[PDB]
Symmetry: D4
Subunit: 164 residues, 8 copies
C-alpha cells in the first residue's frame, strides 16, 4: 500500500531518534516511508518532496531536524499538508535551539511541534490526525490508550516491590 505518512530527517544520524516515529506508525499499521531529506544540503529535493507529497497520497509529514532546524518549517511552507516537527537535540544546548527553531513559526505557516527527541509522539500524533474523522482508527487509538494504562499498573507493581 502507498505511504500515508512520510518520516523525514536531515541526516541518517537522526535515525536513532526518528526511528521511534516509524515504530509508532507501524504499531497502528499505517503505511509510511522514511527519507533523508536535508533543507540545507538538498533544498531542491526538499522542495520537491514537500510539493509532491499530497499527490503521492501522503496525508501527514513528520520531519526531524536539529540546531537551526529549518526542515519542518520549509516543508510546511511548500505543502498544504499538516507537518509535525521533531526537534532533534544536537551536541550543545540539549535541543533548545532545535525547539525554538521549529516551534516559533510566525503567523501564516504552522508547524505541529512535539517534545525534544519526541519522535515516538510525533508518530502517535500523526495517527491521531489520521483518526480524527476515521471512527475505526479512532477506536484503535482508544484501545491503545486503555492498554497504556495497563502498562502503568505493571510499573506500579514493580515500584511496590522496589520500595520493599
Amino acid at each position: 500500500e502507498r505511504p500515508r505518512v512520510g518520516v523525514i530527517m536531515g541526516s541518517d544520524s537522526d535515525w536513532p531518534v526518528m526511528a521511534d516515529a516509524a515504530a509508532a506508525l507501524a504499531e497502528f499499521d499505517i503505511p509510511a516511508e522514511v527519507r533523508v531529506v536535508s533543507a540545507h544540503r538538498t533544498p531542491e529535493a526538499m522542495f520537491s518532496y514537500a510539493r509532491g507529497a499530497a499527490a503521492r497520497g501522503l496525508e501527514v509529514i513528520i520531519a526531524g531536524a536539529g540546531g537551526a532546524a529549518h526542515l519542518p518549517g520549509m516543508v510546511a511552507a511548500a505543502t498544504p499538508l499538516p507537518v509535525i516537527g521533531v526537534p532533534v537535540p544536537l551536541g550543545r544546548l540539549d535541543g533548545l535551539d532545535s525547539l525554538l527553531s521549529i516551534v516559533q513559526m510566525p503567523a501564516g505557516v504552522p508547524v505541529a511541534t512535539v517534545s525534544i527527541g519526541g519522535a515516538g509522539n510525533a508518530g502517535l500524533l500523526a495517527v491521531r490526525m489520521l483518526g480524527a474523522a476515521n471512527p475505526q482508527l479512532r477506536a484503535r487509538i482508544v484501545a491503545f490508550q486503555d492498554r497504556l494504562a495497563d502498562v502503568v499498573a505493571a510499573k506500579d507493581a514493580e515500584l511496590q516491590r522496589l520500595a520493599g
Copy 2:
C-alpha cells in the same frame, strides 16, 4: 451560526480570549464551524475531563487548547481523548511564555500535543485547517489557494519596499 462545531477552541481562563480569538478567526476564514469555551484543567478538572471525553462523540475532530504559565490544559485534554490536540502557549506576565511553551511541548512518550508558537493561536487555527484538509481534496485546494494569496501579498510588499528604498535613495 448555530452550526454543530467541528473544532473546539478552549482556554484555561477567559483572560486568554484576546489571544485565542485568532484561532476562531482562522477557522472562520475556512468556514470551519468551531466553538469557544473556557475549560480549566486546574480549577475544573472534572469538567475538563468531561469535555475531552465527550468531544469525539459530539463531532469534534480537533481541539485547540490555550493556557499559560504551568500550562496543563492541552496535555490533560490530550490524555482524555483520541483526537489530535493543538496546544497554544499563552504568554503571561513573566517569562514571555517560555514556561507556557515548555509545559505544553515537552510531553513524555505516550501522549502527544501538537504545539505551536507562543501566542500563535492563528497558526493553531490554520493547523487545524490543514488537519481537516489532509484527506479532503476540496478543503485542501482552499488551503493551497490561501497559500498562493499569502505569496502574492509578499510580492506586492516586495515591490512596495523596493519603491520605498528607491525613493529614499533618490
Copy 3:
C-alpha cells in the same frame, strides 16, 4: 495507615523519588508509594487525588518530568497540600519540569522543591506535619541540630586535611 503519599509518573522516576520515601522513614512517618500517571492514567490519577483525604492522607508528594502535570493536577483535585518534585529527564536538566510544576496560576498552589529534590520534599512534608505536633516538631529541631553537628565535624576534618596537605 499512610499519612503521606509519594507518587510519580513512571517507575523510572524512582531513583529520584526514593529519597522522599527515605526522608519520611527517617521520621517514622507512614507512607505509601505509587506509580500514577497524569497523562497515561488520568482516571486513576483523579481517583487517587479525590480519595486521598478520605483515605487519611495529609500530604501528597508528586514527582514528574518534562511537561510535568502530575503535581498540579493532583493539587487541583484535593484540598491537601501537594509537594511537587521536578524530575530531570534526558534534556533540559529539569528546567522544563521545574517551570511546569512551579508556575501554577492563581487558585491552585503546588509547593515546589528543587530539581531532583525528593529528599527535601520528604523533609518538607515532615515540617508540615510537625508545625502543630509538639513531639514531631522537637524531632525536626533535633534533626536540624544534627545537621549542624555534621557540618562542624566536616569543617574540622577539612581543616585537618588541608593541614596534612601543607605539612
Copy 4:
C-alpha cells in the same frame, strides 16, 4: 495571635506580597506582616526565624527577589514550613528569584510557589493548616467548588459573547 507570618525584604515587595495577606484573610487566618531583610538585617531575620515557633506561628511565607535568600535563611533557622515567593525585579522576570529560592540543596527545604505567586502562597499555607483541621479543610473544598463555579459562569459568558459576535 498570628498563625502565619508574611515577610519580605522590602516594602517595595508589597504590591506582590499583599496577595498572600489577602488569601489568608479570606480564610480568616490571623497573620502578621513584616519587612525583614536577610541581607540588610541578618540579625533581625535570624531572630524572627528562631522565635517564630515560640511565638505560635505555624507557617512562614517569605518573599524576595534577585539573589533571593530570605526564604532559605528563614527555613534554615526554624522547624516550621517556609513558603518562598519569588519576587520578580527589574531584570530577568524573577528567574533569578525562582532559582535562588527553589534550588535548596539537601537538608533544608523551601516550598516554592510561582513567580509573583503570593496569592497561591497564602492558599498553600491554608492547605497546610487545613490538612488535619476538619472545619478548615471543608472551607478549602468549598473554596475549590466556588472556583469551579466561576469557571462554569465564565465559560457560559464566553459562549454568549462569541454568539453575539457571530450574530
Copy 5:
C-alpha cells in the same frame, strides 16, 4: 550617499515589511560607504519558490553579499545561504516574545556545511558594516575608508566623555 540607478552589490532582504524599521539600518550603513544596495521582501515561509529564485540568481547578477533579516523561527538567512555561494549575513529580528533569542538560535546554529554570518539581535547596522568589511577585504581603497571610519568612532567617544564630566 549612493546615487540612484547603480547595479546593486549587496542585497538587504527580510521576511516581512514589518522588519523594515530594523533592517533600514543595514541599508543606511551601506549608503554611508557608497555601496549600492537593493532592498527586498523575501519570505522563506510564505514564498519559498521566490526565495530560492532570489538566492540562486544573486551572484549572476553581481551581488556579492546578502544581508537577511528574520524573526522567530528565522529560516530566511539559512535557506538563502543553502542556495547561494555568496556570504550571507543573518540579522536576528526580535519579535513580541523572547527578545530575539529564538531568532538568534534559529540563525546562528547552522549545522556543518552551510554557514551564516550572524550578527547581534536587531543589529542591522552592524550587518551593513560587516558587509562593507567583506567588500573591503581585498579592496585597499575601501579598506582605508573603513580604518578612517574606525578612527573617527574614537573622536565621538571623546565628546561623550566630555558630556559625562558635565553630568558627574
Copy 6:
C-alpha cells in the same frame, strides 16, 4: 591541499591551544579550498598587547579574513574586530559549563559600530567555509568552486538516504 610556504590569506586564531581540537576544522576547510592560512594562539585576556598588534598588522600583511575562536567570556573576536578593518568571524568555543551559550552571547551581541560575523557554537568548519565564501564574493573562479561544493553536498545525502532505507 594548500602547499607549504604560501603567504597566508586567512588567519585562524584562538585564545588558548586547548581550543585547537575545535578550531582545527576551520583550518581544514580552508585547506580544502586551497586557501593559505596561518594558525595562531592570540589571547585577548593574557596577551592584550600582542592581540592588538596582530589585529592592526593583519591587513598590511595581506590577510583578508580573521577567524577567531574563544570560549566563556569570549572577547577575542570582538577585540580583534575593534582593531582591524578586516571581517572577523567569531567561533564560540563551548567550555565546561553552559554549552557555549556564554561564548555565543559574548561574541554575537556586539553593540553598534564593530561587527563580528558569528557562527554556531563549535562551528569552526563553518567558519572556514564562510571565510571561503567571503573570498569568493568577487572571485568568480573561487565562487564556482563553492557552487560545486554545494552541489556535491547533495550527492552525500543520497548515500545517507540509501543507508536509511537499509536501516528502516
Copy 7:
C-alpha cells in the same frame, strides 16, 4: 585629592546606571573619577587607561558595559588592580548577555562581577576593597551597615500601615 577609584563605561548612555557607583563612593568620601572609555571604539584609550591606572594612584576600577560586554575583562587584562564589572542591561536579553560576557572569565584573569545594573553595589564593593586593611574605613562600613538596618525598620513601619 587624586582619585583612588575609577568609574568607567563605554557610553555616556550608561550613566543613568553607573551614576550609582559614583554616588556610593561619594557617600564614603572616596576620591573618584568617571570616564567614558570604550573597549570597542577606543581600544587604545582603554589600554592606556588600564595600564596607567596604578601609577596614577587608582586602587580599583569599576567598569560598566552591555551586550558583548568586554570592557571590564579587557581592563583587567591590562592592569594588576582589581576590576569590578557592572553588567549594563541593553534593549534585549535584560543584561543576561552582559552578565555572561563579564563574569565567565577563563582561568588567569579575574573580574569581580556585580548584579545586572548593580552600579551602586559596585561602589560599595570598591569601598569594602579599600577597607579590607584600613581599620578606620572598615569602621565606617560597619556604621553604614548599622544605618542600613535602621532604614529597614522604617520600611517595616510603612508596611504595617499599608497592611491596614
Copy 8:
C-alpha cells in the same frame, strides 16, 4: 604552615572542596596565608554568622565563599562582615551552575558580592590577590610579573601551534 590566615576560603559543603581547592592553590602561589573551612549558610546559620562577624578581628582581609544550587553562603557572609566577599558559583548536578551564578551575583542594592565565573575558584584566589595588592607595591609587582609570565606562555604556545600547523601543511 601554622601562619595566621589573611584570606578565608570557605564553602557550603566538603563536596565543594575539589573546586574550591584551586582558590587555596592560587593564594599559595602568592605566599598569602589562607584557611579553608566548611561553613554552611543552610545547615549552620548561627556558625556561619559567627564566622563572618569574627573574620576581620581575626585578621582576615578577604573571604572567598563557594556554594552551589540556591547558593546563599557568599551573600549571607557579606551581610555580616564589612570585608569584601568573593563568591564562587559551584556547579551542581543540574543546570551547570546557572542557578549558583544567579543566586550569588544578583544581590540587590545594599550588600555586594564580587562574583567570579562558574567553577572559577582559581580566579577567586587571583582576585583576592589583586585586592591585597591594590595598595601594596611589592605584591602588586608580583602580580605584574605573574601576568607577564602568562603572556610569555601564550607566546610559546603560539609558536608551537604554528609549528604544528606548518607540519600538517607539510
